[PDB]
Ligand binder design. Sequence first.
Ligand SMILES: [Cl-]
Ligand SMILES: [Mg+2]
Ligand SMILES: [Mg+2]
Ligand code: NA
Length: 329
Amino acid sequence: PAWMPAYACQRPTPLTHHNTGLSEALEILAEAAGFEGSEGRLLTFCRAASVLKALPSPVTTLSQLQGLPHFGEHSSRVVQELLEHGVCEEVERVRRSERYQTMKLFTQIFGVGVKTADRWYREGLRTLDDLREQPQKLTQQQKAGLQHHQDLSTPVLRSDVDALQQVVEEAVGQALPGATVTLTGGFRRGKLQGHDVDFLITHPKEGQEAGLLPRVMCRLQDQGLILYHQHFERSFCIFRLPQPGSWKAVRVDLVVAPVSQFPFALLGWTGSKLFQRELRRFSRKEKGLWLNSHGLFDPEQKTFFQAASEEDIFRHLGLEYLPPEQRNA
DNA sequence: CGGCAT
DNA sequence: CGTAT
DNA sequence: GCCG
Ligand SMILES: [Cl-]
Ligand SMILES: [Mg+2]
Ligand SMILES: [Mg+2]
Ligand code: NA
């Protein structure tokens, strides 16, 4: 074989694709590589899984992997075992291991990453109750993650997104007339659920957005909508989202950008995570330009590319434009 | 050999 | 260290 | 783990 460019930003990856079983197995090995501190192996297994999401048809024979980028001896063997036996011994051993299950449990807590989870694992901790019994080990961020863990493990749905966008738009409009709110993240790519909702806030007049996020947060807090906030241009918070007769905690990310940076922030925050890593790698390695959510920098001329749209950025990098629903790498 | 996004 | 895509 |  199939046409397959090496970088994920060079090919469409739709929301619904084939090979979900094969990719999920490779993504288990990627996650486990991360849990052992091997970011390089994590990346290769993520990239191999993503290649399968971009293929036109189901892989039913090992020969369909010939020539595909990021498939070497290890990733090919995993696919071969799945095709020949329906199961891969290495994947099952990882999946069922105490180490994997505990690291997955701990790293899913808001405020806990691999290094913290591994430290706790090495100390003999295994359950969330173990963590509650030792609150001296916890940051304020981790305390919020643990206190709201049940709700934060409940997938966020589109009905929640629409309600949250309304309350964010109300607070933003009270804080700065003319400011806008754009849904980003996985929901913009067409996903039907997420672990959070991501919003990007700007104003059409450059500079007017300075100081906006503290004003938005104060207004949300005054409506009783904020359970946790980090206290700036990014706010990783937990909202008290009204439900009929009650409420549920929901993770919400709010990001402010000046309008000059909006296309870059929209591109970055729409993802996917792998798509953006691959896009930034492509930009630096293939074009010599440095990309992030603030701009696209030419380090030789020492200038920033002025963009008005995501399309402008793709074109400047020599890439065919992909709409958000084709960025699900 | 080392890079692997910022 | 954690967070984000 | 794969590749530039
Ligand atoms: Cl989905
Ligand atoms: Mg998200
Ligand atoms: Mg988010
Ligand atoms: Na976490």
